[PDB]
Design a protein around this ligand. Structure first.
Ligand SMILES: [Cl-]
Ligand SMILES: [Cl-]
Ligand SMILES: [Zn+2]
Ligand SMILES: [Zn+2]
Lengths: 366, 366
């Protein structure tokens, strides 16, 4: 396999389906990436992640650079070996969580200093030490809402940081030859800033383009409005990655607007909290109505959990605080997300994605 | 298969190896039973429990009679169906944990009343509703130390309760025809009381005989001293079950004294707390010395954890509080216990158990 090759096999409107080929494996798109915080997809062995259909996982950098440390992971053979996942890993830059999770942060043009310095150069180096396959440029995730002036200042700094990220990645031969680098479009909800950001990123040149700054509480209508004008600004022939999204209906609508890749903690985190996704909408398995329900979490789901255990049993486990409850809910939810992506890919390939989206919504929101 | 058949295939001194055949499966003896609290072996799917080599698990009754409730489990199809374990389950009577975990307990000849009535009859009924394969008679676990008078009074009540348990079990045709009933020897550390208890139990007649009251903080020397005279008092041709034991060296010495069955929470509970069993003794994986150790938990262990992950990774997971850490430590520890039992069975079958016990101790305590 090549370092990186994205091929589009079929299209319907703005939606696309295809593959990314990388040295460590093929990624089917549109793709959902389960999130690995701290070198684990919470409550799942990697073989179980793979059994759900995942082709790639996201590794959070912020936690790993603190514990166990990036240099330590490199000394131990890299993240893939360490956690036992041998397929592609996309790593975030660490910049978003440094702001969310640190104390006493101090921002400058050089980077961010924080207490538990992270610059573009150090972020790219950390991602190299982890052995990331898809490296994210280091940027500033603009708060929402943002004034036009502040959104512009933040986007402009992020574009300067994108060039620094590109140059740091290219100056490390092993990384440049074996990994890919994605740039991140910013600009808040403002069309002119989104266009300037797209133009700057395309001039630098990246292997893929993320739409940043949209998992920030703005609501689906506004997110879709921004995607409507933002995704067409990005190069058509490269993957489009919507960071931090999202709920099933967010994914469907984002694919309808040209997005190829997704990640979010919802299936894992909300699974451990008792929320199970089904084709008829989410359910909270802790509800007393499930205490004697012998049906599986979802009546059509093909996952191992739905083949073997009832709602009543999982209700009991989650109410009791049992680890197996978290394991089963997470496996089912990640499997549900992968089945959603498979239905999306198949429907685009067959020219019936518009109908699929309509049928999906009618049933999910009934 | 029959309802119950215990066959001894080989013997060395007081040690025995053989099989218990029951409707739901064969149990190889000496046997270690992983403990299922609240209808789950904590942090493991049943298929993983089986992959470690377990033939039978122990279900705690006290928790289940409270949550989800025995009648509810019966309505849902029984414990086996509920949790997805189709092999034999031994259930405790609930009497020990009612004393440990309840408030405002009130004891009488009829049974025990408590706040979150449990009589011999109700205990046997609960175990029936769960669908237990091996039912334990309801008894009083005598505190340690106990005066001779108090040990005698408690043992005498337990023998009256053993007869009530026998009669309740026999009066339920489906239970009598499909399950087995074990009686529990009491008498604290006193040889004369242990003999009276053995005689009373043998007169009633049971499918197997437990040695009760020895997982109570008395120390290994005293436990072994009591086993030395207590196990020969029980019928030779029936299984001997040492309840609540124990550490690996406790198991080896108890087998040398004629015990066939064991259960304890040590491998599961202490696994979640960071203690891993190895042929060279236990280690605490949280210790900083393991942070860069690429070896598996144990250098000879055949378990899936030791084939795939390093000490350094599991150290990281346990320090981070990650669910996968609990999963991996528990799988390894239960696998270690099953490998110990396999080595015990093979060495007795080959007439070299005395040498095995000596070699085991020399290395485990080096
Ligand atoms: Cl998560
Ligand atoms: Cl436990
Ligand atoms: Zn499922
Ligand atoms: Zn192992």
């Amino acid at each position: 396999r090549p370092r990186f090759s994205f091929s589009i096999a079929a299209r319907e409107g703005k939606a696309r389906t295809g593959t990314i080929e990388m040295k460590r494996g093929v990624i089917r798109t549109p793709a959902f990436m389960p999130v690995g915080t701290a070198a684990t997809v919470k409550a799942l062995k990697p073989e179980t992640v793979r059994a759900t259909g995942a082709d790639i996982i996201l590794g959070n950098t912020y936690h790993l650079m603190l514990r166990p440390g990036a240099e330590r992971i490199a000394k131990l053979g890299g993240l893939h070996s360490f956690m036992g996942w041998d397929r592609p890993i996309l790593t975030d830059s660490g910049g978003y969580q440094v702001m969310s999770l640190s104390s006493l942060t101090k921002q400058s043009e050089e980077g961010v200093t924080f207490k538990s310095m992270l610059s573009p150069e150090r972020s790219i180096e950390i991602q190299h030490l982890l052995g990331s396959d898809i490296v994210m440029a280091f940027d500033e995730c603009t708060p929402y809402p943002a004034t036009p002036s502040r959104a512009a200042s933040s986007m402009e700094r992020s574009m300067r940081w994108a060039k620094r990220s590109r140059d740091a990645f290219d100056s490390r031969k092993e990384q440049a030859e074996n990994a890919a680098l994605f740039g991140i479009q910013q600009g808040s909800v403002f069309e002119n800033l989104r266009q300037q950001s797209a133009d700057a990123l395309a001039e630098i040149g990246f292997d893929g383009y993320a739409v940043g700054g949209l998992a920030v509480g703005e609501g689906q209508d506004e997110m879709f409005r921004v995607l409507d004008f933002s995704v067409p600004m990005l190069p058509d022939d490269k993957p489009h990655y919507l960071m931090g999204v999202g709920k099933p209906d967010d994914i469907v609508g984002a694919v309808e607007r040209g997005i190829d890749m997704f990640d979010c903690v919802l299936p894992t985190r909300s699974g451990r909290n008792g929320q199970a996704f089904t084709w008829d909408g989410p359910i909270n398995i802790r509800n007393a109505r499930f205490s004697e329900d012998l049906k599986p979490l979802d009546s059509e789901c093909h996952c191992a959990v739905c083949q073997k255990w009832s709602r009543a049993y999982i209700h009991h486990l989650i109410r009791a605080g049992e680890i197996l409850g978290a394991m089963l809910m997470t496996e089912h939810n990640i499997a549900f997300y992968q089945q959603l992506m498979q239905k999306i890919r198949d429907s685009i390939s067959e020219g019936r994605f518009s109908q699929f989206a309509q049928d999906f919504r009618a049933r999910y929101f009934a």
